[PDB]
Amino acid sequence: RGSTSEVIEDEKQFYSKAKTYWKQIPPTVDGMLGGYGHISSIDINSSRKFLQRFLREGPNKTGTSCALDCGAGIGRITKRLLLPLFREVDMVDITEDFLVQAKTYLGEEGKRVRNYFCCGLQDFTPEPDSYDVIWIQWVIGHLTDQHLAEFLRRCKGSLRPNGIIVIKDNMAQEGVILDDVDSSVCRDLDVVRRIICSAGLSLLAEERQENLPDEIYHVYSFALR
Amino acid sequence: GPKK
């Protein structure tokens, strides 16, 4: 199957099951990564290099005023990727326990987190003309094909001039695969690009994550606006 | 996050 439509047979339960799952996950980095905390630094290093291209090299360079971290969890990415590069950061996540723990986890630099939005991305509207970078990592699998497209379109309206959206997530080898543990889907490259491009966003960059463990799904980063 |  090549669409959520076919592999997701109950959309209501697709969302409620995932909400239930994350509600009882420990608010820790090992929880944010399903036992793969040992690749967090490898992940962040590649994300930093991927993003520095847009922040440094002009002439339409991306600003450093504010970033949005979507599906931020306890702030693993906000802490080590976004806060060092952006003056202020907003976080949005559906799990209250993760936003509460993020206050402690982020430490003193967490004071530059402006808003802790508690909302599913399918119901969330980022404020217009607010963000230089919108970072969406390991959460697009929790949205249906349609909701993802519509969320990306709402993100487009919240970008400042020269801003970009970044998606970083697992890719399936073929088709759309449902994970019955956490109630998420994994889509192949063709499906993701189609959802992006057919939603009215331009693909600016695309990069496969190297040096990952052999046993895990491939991971891709996309830059779009 | 990452999956097998």
Curated annotation (Swiss-Prot), chain A:
Modified residues (N-acetylthreonine): 4
Secretion signal span: none
UniProt EC number: 2.1.1.244
Residues where S-adenosyl-L-methionine binds: 71, 76, 93-95, 121-122, 137
Top-rank taxon: Eukaryota
Substitution effect: residue 169 to A: Does not affect methyltransferase activity
Listed Pfam families: Methyltransf_PK (PF05891)
Reaction equations catalysed: N-terminal L-alanyl-L-prolyl-L-lysyl-[protein] + 3 S-adenosyl-L-methionine = N-terminal N,N,N-trimethyl-L-alanyl-L-prolyl-L-lysyl-[protein] + 3 S-adenosyl-L-homocysteine + 3 H(+); N-terminal L-seryl-L-prolyl-L-lysyl-[protein] + 3 S-adenosyl-L-methionine = N-terminal N,N,N-trimethyl-L-seryl-L-prolyl-L-lysyl-[protein] + 3 S-adenosyl-L-homocysteine + 3 H(+); N-terminal L-prolyl-L-prolyl-L-lysyl-[protein] + 2 S-adenosyl-L-methionine = N-terminal N,N-dimethyl-L-prolyl-L-prolyl-L-lysyl-[protein] + 2 S-adenosyl-L-homocysteine + 2 H(+)
Keywords of this entry: Acetylation, Methyltransferase, Nucleus, S-adenosyl-L-methionine, Transferase
Cellular localisation: Nucleus
GO cellular component, one term: nucleoplasm
Any one GO molecular function term: histone methyltransferase activity
InterPro entries with a match to the protein in the record: MeTrfase_NTM1 (IPR008576), SAM-dependent_MTases_sf (IPR029063)
Function: Distributive alpha-N-methyltransferase that methylates the N-terminus of target proteins containing the N-terminal motif [Ala/Gly/Pro/Ser]-Pro-Lys when the initiator Met is cleaved. Specifically catalyzes mono-, di- or tri-methylation of the exposed alpha-amino group of the Ala, Gly or Ser residue in the [Ala/Gly/Ser]-Pro-Lys motif and mono- or di-methylation of Pro in the Pro-Pro-Lys motif. Some of the substrates may be primed by NTMT2-mediated monomethylation.
Family: Belongs to the methyltransferase superfamily. NTM1 family.
Protein's name in the database: N-terminal Xaa-Pro-Lys N-methyltransferase 1
Gene designation: NTMT1
